[PDB]
Structures are given as C-alpha cells and as structure tokens.
Nucleic acid binder design. Structure first.
Ligand SMILES: [Zn+2]
Ligand SMILES: [Zn+2]
Ligand SMILES: [Zn+2]
Lengths: 372, 503
RNA sequence: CCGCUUCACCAUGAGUGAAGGUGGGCUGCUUGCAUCAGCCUAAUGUCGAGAAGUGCUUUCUUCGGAAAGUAACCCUCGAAACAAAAGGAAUGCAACGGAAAUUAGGUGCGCUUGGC
DNA sequence: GCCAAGCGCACCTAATTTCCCAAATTA
DNA sequence: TAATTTGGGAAATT
C-alpha cells in the first residue's frame, strides 16, 4: 500500500512567534537526531566489542532517544516521529560492513515530525502552551521558548495553507503530510515515423511515446565505417553481428512500446499492416535505412509482447496517414512527402481547423482513430 | 609565506630493492643486451637503418622474464616485489578509509556529546592528536600513516560549521582513498629520503615488517597482513618513480617548471614532507600506482608593480579579456580550441543511455552509467588543460606589461552575468578563476576578486552610466561596438573591472 | 550510408556533385590536441557472480519491529583492446597542484494530484 | 510529452574550504 | 638519530 505525500505552503496561521518556534524545534530535534546516531554508533562499534543486535538498538532508542526528545519537547508526537526517524537511519548491517558512516543532517533540511483536524485550507494540530524562558542561555541563543505538556496545557495551533512534517522550502514553510492509499474502450495507435522510427499515441488522450534512433544511428555509422575500411570473410561476420544487434534492438523497442501502453491502461492498440509500412515512401525506415530492415520481426515482437501484457492488437489500413488531420480530418493535399523534402521536414498544419504539431504524432493520432 | 605548495604526480615503476638486488637486476639486463649483440634505434645505431625503439631488438632484449624473477625470489628471499606491495597498498587504502570514518565519529562524540561542545579551534589540535592519531597508531603502528591521517581528517572536520549544524560529519565512500604519509621537514628534519641512483627518482617510505595473517576473514579478504611497528622492527619500502618521458620533455633543460621542480626534488634542494599514494587506472588485473609528492616552491619574482592595476572580465565575443588601468594594451582569449571542445562534448552526449531505463539495466547504477562516467572523465581533463592554457596566456600578458595587482569579476557576477560567452554559446568558474589566480600567485601578481557596479554599460573613459547598451539592445543590433552619451564592448567591461574604486 | 571533414555550389539544412576519412575506442609508461604503429569494436553493446540495501513472498510477535527466502531494481562487485607489472614501446605542439570533504543546484526515473 | 509541485533515490556538477606542521620526548 | 607523540579549554538567525 503506497504513501501519497501532499506538501502545501503555511503562508498564514500570530506569525513571527510561529517562525521562531519552528526554527527552534528544527534545531533542537536535529541535535537529538545527530547526537543519537553518533552516541549509538559509538556504543555498538567504538565501545561494545564491535557487535550488538537490534535488541540493543531498541533498548537505546526506546530508553535514551525517546526519553530525551520527550522530556525536552513534552509532545509525544514529535518524540515518537523522531524516535522512528533515528531507528530508520541507524541501519545496523549497512554499518557492520564499514561500507560507510552515519547520515548526519544539517539543522535546516531536517523536517520537524508531528501527528489531523482540517477545514476548507486550515490545518489544526495539538501543541503544548509555550511560555518563554526568563533565563536565556548565553551559548544557546536560538532556543527562546520552553514547551509544556499537551495534556496539562494544550494550546493547539492552526495553519491556513495554500504522519505530518514541517520544513523550509527548496524562506517560507512547507507542510508535508503522507496519507495511506491503496480498459478495452480506450484505443491506441502505433505509426512508423520519419524522424522517430515508431511513434505511439492514444485517441481522445494527449499522451505519447516516440522511439529515438540515437542507439540505431550511432551503431549504423560505426558499421558503415568498419565496412569502408574493410573494402581496402570478415564483412560476412559483421553482417551476422549486425543482425544480432538489430534483433535485440527491436525487442527493446517492443518492451518500451508495451510499457507505454500498459501505463495508460490502453487495452486495444492498432497499427497499419505489413505492406502499408513496408512501402510508405515517407517512413524513417525507407528514407534513412534504404528500405532494408526486418519489418515482419518488428511487428511480431511488438504484437507478442503487447499480447503478453493482455493488450489486443488490431491491424488497420493507412487512409492518407501523413496528409489527413487528426483533430478534424481535412486532407492538406499540399502536405506531399515532396513538399516536406524541399523544406527541413516541418510540423503539420490543418488550415481548416488550424492544428500545427509533429507530423509523426499527427500520423499516430490518425491511426489510433477507431473507424480505420 | 614567501613560498607556494604544489604537487608532483609521479607514476611508481616498481618497488626498488637493496644495492645488491638492483645491481644483479641491472647486470642481467646488460647481460641480455650483450648476448643479443639488421635495423636499430638511435642508441643502438651509435652501437643499419633507424627504426622506432618499440621495433628495436637491442631495446626489446633487456625486458626480463619470470625465469629470472624466480631465480631472484630464490637468491634474495627478503627483497620486495610488486605483488606483496600492491596487496599492502590495497589493504592500506581500505584501512585508511575505515579509520577516517570511525575517527570523524569518535571525534564528533568526544567534542560535542562527551565534551558538551566546550571546544575552540586549538582544543581541536588536542582532540585530533588524542582521538584520531591514537586510533591510526593502534592500527598502522607507523607514525607516518598515523600523522598523515591526522592531517587528512583535520582538513575535513570543521568545528564551527559542525557545532551550528551548517553541515554533516564527513564520510568517505571511495574504492580508491589515498594513503597519506607525513615525514617532518625543515630544521634538523629532511622529509622523505629521496635518492637518485644513476639518475632515477627513488623515494623511501618508512615501514615495518609484514607477516601474512594466519586466520584471514572470509567476508573481507583484503586484510591480508599484520604490520610490526617501524621503531621496533623496520622494513622500509623504496619506490622507483618514472622520470624518463620527462627527461625528454625539453623542459628538462630549463630553470622554471615541473621538470625543474622534479630535478630539484631529486637533487635534494626541495624537500617533501607529504606524499599521498593512490591507484591510477587498471592495466591488467593490476593497477597504476601514482605517488603525489607535495613540495613548496619559492615565488619567481620577475619585476611586477602593484602601482599598475589590471583587469579580467568575461566577454561575449571572447570568453575572457584583459586590461590595464591606463596603458591601452589588452589581451583576448581566442575561442578556437573552445569550439573544437564544444563539437566534442556534443558527441559525448549519451542522453538515451542516461534516460531510457531499458538500456544497460539490472547490474546496478555503477554499470548503468559506465559509458557516461568514462566520457566525463575524458572531458573534464580537456577543460582542465584548456583553462590552464588560458591562465598561462593571461599570466604571460600581465607579466610582459609588469602588473602586480589584477582585479577580476566576482564569481556570482560571471556565473549569473547573463551576457557571458559561457551563457550565450555553451562551465566551472571556481576552477577557471582558481587556475588563473594560482598562476598569477606563482610570479607575484595579487588577485582581488572585485564588485561590478554596472560594468558592461559604464563609460571606461568619462564615467557616464548608460541603460541603452543593455543586453537586449546590444543583442538586437547583435553585439555591436560601444559608444557613450557624455563623451569595443568586452575591452570596456574588463577596463571597468580594472577600476581601483571598486570593493 | 555521413545528424563526418573539406572544395564548392544551392535553398539554418537528416540539401546536390567531387575527393578523402572510424564517423567509436584501447596501450605507447603525468595530461590535452594532432599524428604514427599495433589492437578491440554488436560496446549508446552483451553478460557473469553476488546479497549490503529499496522492494516482494512467507512467518513471528513482547505489534516498534524481528526471522527467513527470493533476485525486479540508477541493487552490489566485475568483464574488449599494443609488443614479448620490473621502464619493450613513439613524433609534433601545448600545458602540468593535488587530495579529501562539505554545501548547493540540477539531471535522470517512478508515483500522488491537474491541464494543454 | 511537457509543465508544475513534491517526494524518494542516486548521480553529477559547481563552488568553497582546508591541508600539505612544528616541537619535544623516547627508544 | 629517527620515529613517535603531543599540542587546550563555549557566544544564532531574521
Ligand atoms: Zn483539421
Ligand atoms: Zn634500441
Ligand atoms: Zn564617456
């Protein structure tokens, strides 16, 4: 069961009294925490024969740490959240490695623990009645206020914000709280691109995934180079190795496509048939890889992985993919591959509904249309 | 004082031995060169067609084989060879990091927890020696490693920052942590015994006998050896350090620079009192062991006047520009080598391997990033040497014109200028600024990192403070020449950093 | 083939002709850039061994947690590259202060809310 | 896919800081 | 003569 953490700014609650109280509880708790990890490490390792169990870490944390941070703060919530915060961070086996030392925080980025009442928003938290101390320590000049019990003098404080924590923002005071929290209709579309090998998209949604050819292009470069140099039989062996790389690459694109669909729940996905993305004339594969590629294996790996995640693959027809508009459907007859080559492969533009973006995602959304 | 500290980073060839064992090594090498004697290298033409040494046989003759080294491990059974030394240094690098961590913790505990925080900057000398030295001396039984660790801790333990909790107790998480080593120098003391037998750079590190552990741990096998105390029963380790490629460097026949510093440390003129040994790069299974000597060299003191005050400012056309209060002589750091570097750091941009998460996956994060990690190591060596070359240039300039104070734009002013060559067309300003500072130091020049006061706009001659030559205006014309309302851009910006008025 | 260089020429270029070329890396003994000799290169790859940790499954409770197991993990350690460890190994130009740590911000990925 | 906001985890990059001692005592 | 050990004593952020 997961923990959703909402963190919203205590802009108002008076004020400066609250800011000063927070600074002080931050510092005071950071002392207990750093000094408790240190006092504890010192007792197991640097004194106690270099051995102790979770038994002793328990005896110490329950006795020394909780009794200190409770006899000071007089607030069960702070002392208990803090007791947990040390227990968490004193990992006895991580330390028996001498793999590293101790997580010792600076008294700023250290969150105040706390453990409620809320209206629409005003948070409301049980806190002790603080009276200022009449004798201020010369050497500890940041601690001004001494707190009282939350049963004997409960002065519960409210905060108008725009397991509970309080902490600085990276001047203003964020308040976190964690809470405990535990589709065959939605249709998706995969279309072979011209700048991205395969771009997949969802109909009536805005979400997409585009497959980068960086890995593919870099490999292709190096392979051509070895060829050029070899042409002044190893070239046969380069062929077999090259095939092994392409085969594993297609598997990795199939995993990435399947993951992008399973994320958005997309339970039916459709993509143009073998002939329709073998002879597309504007496809990445034909205009970069000189129409030499294993299309069959690509579609077969994609469909096998996509059916191994419960998603159903439907094999549609193109119906003027590049040219037709996703959002309305007026063919921009000007948008010939020919038009696109003379330029530097620009975005789409439907002059009828006025919707300009990436012709590959356009094509993707043209596929994903159910009436195909 | 009148001096400046530097390292000399030096590669360990092989552990050196007795005069006996090294005599027999040498004489077998000449024995094989005499045995062997169509083509040759120059040394073996003077003893035909010239070939590169790699291809020569009267060089290739000498390299000794395990047959001899076994005949030697037989003859002289106490002599020291690479295996035992590499095992020892691997142990000492682990034990050192373990000590550095448990010592910072014991120190934190004895100052704040036990003490109750009643500590100033001099009781810290006390606590360091008591806690941290004593711990290291129980382990290593070798004052030099113990005293070396005292210092390597003292460097990272900040008492006022640690009391006001403006940071956390430092902890090292490193495979390759230096072994530090302190022998005292100056007065009746000399530092580490440097020798030069037949012009080779030998350093002798004080060490105690080592006997391999009977019952070795299963979980940490590296802890193999059990050091005697050096005062009790000593076995020193002498290292031969490589000075061959430097003996060819053309700087080896010069009065200033790294080659002359090495010649001085070998001659005995400079003494070393800190060495710091750590591994370089894996060669087979087995590594390159670097030894980083630390010397203090005097100031060069070629005539400079504090009367003449100079300026450095980050310029739009050229990445640094240099000026003098009232001379009219300038310098501009050309942007040619930086451009070659920018083309390269585009190639080394594995954004897919960084982000995909299907790639290089299921062996942990050290291997997920190996490709990227290896390119940043090679790239941050490019930038370093480039920055050094500029600082070299800048220094030469000021020295020519005889400047003694150089004011340079404060780190914030540059890092967030928003019209720097580094911002417009691209960076470490700590490193860039430090490397310039440190070069100038060496000759006598004094840097004072100064405040801007509307630098880019202010008239360098009459004093008018403009708002017309603002970034977007100049950007709009596209970085045009500079003129004033009351009477080059980069030159002006530098020459208003060269204003003694600023603070 | 080029999201390689240069010679150009056309309309910033994943344009067209001509010539060339790892267009990626490893060793050459401190480093960088360029050569050079030899090499690896499916390397933005492929995989091995492991259990410290995030998680997970099973139990146990004195309900904080504890003990087992798995092995998904930006989980842990590791894996290509000169010649025949011990100066066998270059040419040109340029440089050479290193180490440790802290702090900050950011990159990268997952989720809880919302939109384009 | 990006943006905004924050959390959790690990890595990367930049900036800063500090050390690289000296004296006295004991084998 | 070289290696080893010792050195001293509070005070913040908006
Ligand atoms: Zn339309
Ligand atoms: Zn020769
Ligand atoms: Zn003027």
């Amino acid at each position: 069961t997961i923990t959703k953490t909402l963190k919203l700014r205590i802009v108002r609650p008076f004020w400066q009294e609250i800011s000063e109280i927070f600074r002080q509880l931050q510092k005071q708790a950071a002392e207990i925490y750093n000094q408790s990890l240190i006092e504890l490490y010192y007792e197991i390792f640097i004194k106690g024969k270099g051995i102790a169990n979770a038994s002793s870490v328990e005896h110490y944390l329950s006795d020394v740490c909780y009794t200190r941070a409770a006899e000071l703060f007089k607030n069960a919530a702070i002392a208990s959240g803090l007791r947990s915060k040390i227990k968490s961070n004193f990992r006895l086996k991580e330390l028996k490695n001498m793999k590293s030392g101790l997580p010792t925080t600076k008294s700023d980025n250290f969150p105040i623990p706390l453990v409620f009442e809320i209206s629409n928003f005003i948070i409301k938290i049980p806190f002790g009645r603080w009276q200022v101390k009449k004798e201020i320590d010369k050497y500890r000049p940041w601690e001004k206020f001494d707190f009282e019990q939350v049963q004997k003098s409960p002065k519960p404080i409210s905060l108008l914000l725009s397991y509970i924590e309080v902490k600085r923002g990276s001047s203003a005071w964020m308040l976190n709280l964690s809470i405990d929290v535990p589709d065959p209709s939605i249709i998706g579309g995969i279309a072979v691109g011209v700048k991205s090998p395969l771009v997949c998209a969802i109909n009536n949604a805005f979400s997409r995934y585009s497959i980068s050819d960086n890995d593919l292009f870099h490999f292709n470069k190096k392979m051509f180079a070895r060829r050029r140099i070899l042409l002044k039989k190893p070239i046969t062996i380069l062929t077999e190795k090259s095939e092994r790389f392409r085969k594993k690459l297609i598997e990795r694109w199939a995993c990435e496509i399947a993951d992008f669909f399973i994320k958005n729940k997309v339970g039916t996905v459709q993509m143009e048939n073998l002939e329709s993305m073998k002879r597309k004339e504007d496809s990445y594969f034909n205009i970069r890889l000189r129409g030499f590629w294993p299309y069959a294996e690509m579609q077969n790996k994609i469909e096998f992985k996509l059916k191994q995640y419960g998603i159903e693959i439907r094999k549609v027809a193109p119906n003027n993919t590049s040219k037709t508009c996703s959002k309305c459907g007026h063919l921009n007859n000007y948008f010939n591959f020919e038009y696109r080559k003379k330029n530097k492969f620009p975005h789409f533009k439907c002059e009828k509904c006025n919707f300009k973006e990436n012709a590959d995602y356009n094509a993707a959304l043209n596929i994903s249309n159910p009436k195909l | 004082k009148n001096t400046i500290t530097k390292t000399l980073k030096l590669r360990i060839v092989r552990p050196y031995n007795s005069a006996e064992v090294e005599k027999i090594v040498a004489d077998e090498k000449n024995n094989r060169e005499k045995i062997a004697l169509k083509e040759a290298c120059s040394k073996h033409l003077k003893v035909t067609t010239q070939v590169e040494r790699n291809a020569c046989l009267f060089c290739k003759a000498r390299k000794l084989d395990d047959k001899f080294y076994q005949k030697l491990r037989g003859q002289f059974p106490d002599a020291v060879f690479w295996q035992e030394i590499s095992e020892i240094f691997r142990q000492l690098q682990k034990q050192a990091a373990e000590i550095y961590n448990q010592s910072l913790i014991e120190l934190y505990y004895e100052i704040f927890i036990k003490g109750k925080g009643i500590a100033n900057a001099s009781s810290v000398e006390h606590y360091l020696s008591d806690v941290c030295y004593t711990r290291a001396a129980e382990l290593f039984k070798n004052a030099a490693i113990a005293s070396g660790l005292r210092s390597k801790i003292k460097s990272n333990f900040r008492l006022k920052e640690l009391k006001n909790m403006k940071s956390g107790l430092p902890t090292t998480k490193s495979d390759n942590f230096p072994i530090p080593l302190v022998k005292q120098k100056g007065g009746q003391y000399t530092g580490f015994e440097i020798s030069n037998h037949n012009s080779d750079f030998i350093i002798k590190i004080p060490f105690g006998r080592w006997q391999v552990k009977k019952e070795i741990d299963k979980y940490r096998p590296w802890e193999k050896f059990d050091f005697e105390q050096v005062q009790k029963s000593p076995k020193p380790i002498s290292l031969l350090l490589s000075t061959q490629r430097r003996k060819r460097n053309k700087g080896w026949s010069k009065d200033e620079g790294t080659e002359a510093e090495i010649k001085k440390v070998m001659n005995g003129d400079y003494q070393t009192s800190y060495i710091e040994v750590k591994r370089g790069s894996k060669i087979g299974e087995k590594s390159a062991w670097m030894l980083n000597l630390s010397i203090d060299v005097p100031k060069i003191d070629k005539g400079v006047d504090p009367s003449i005050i100079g300026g450095i400012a980050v310029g739009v056309k050229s990445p640094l520009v240099c000026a003098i209060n009232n001379a009219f002589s300038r310098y501009s750091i050309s942007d040619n080598d930086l451009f070659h570097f920018n083309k390269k750091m585009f190639a080394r941009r594995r954004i897919l391997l960084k982000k995909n998460r299907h790639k290089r996956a299921g062996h942990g994060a050290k291997n997920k990033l190996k490709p990227i990690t290896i390119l940043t190591e090679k790239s941050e060596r490019f930038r370093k040497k480039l920055i050094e070359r500029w600082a070299c240039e800048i220094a030469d300039f000021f020295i020519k014109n005889k400047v003694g104070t150089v004011q340079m734009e404060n780190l914030e002013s540059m890092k967030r200028k928003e019209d720097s060559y580094f911002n417009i067309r691209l960076w470490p300003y700590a490193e860039m600024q430090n490397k310039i500072e440190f070069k100038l130091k060496q000759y006598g020049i004094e840097i004072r990192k100064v405040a801007p006061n509307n630098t880019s706009k202010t008239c360098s001659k009459c004093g008018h403070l403009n708002n017309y030559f603002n970034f977007e205006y100049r950007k709009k014309n596209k970085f045009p020449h500079f003129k004033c309302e009351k009477c080059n851009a980069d030159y002006n910006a530098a020459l208003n950093i060269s204003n003694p008025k600023l603070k």
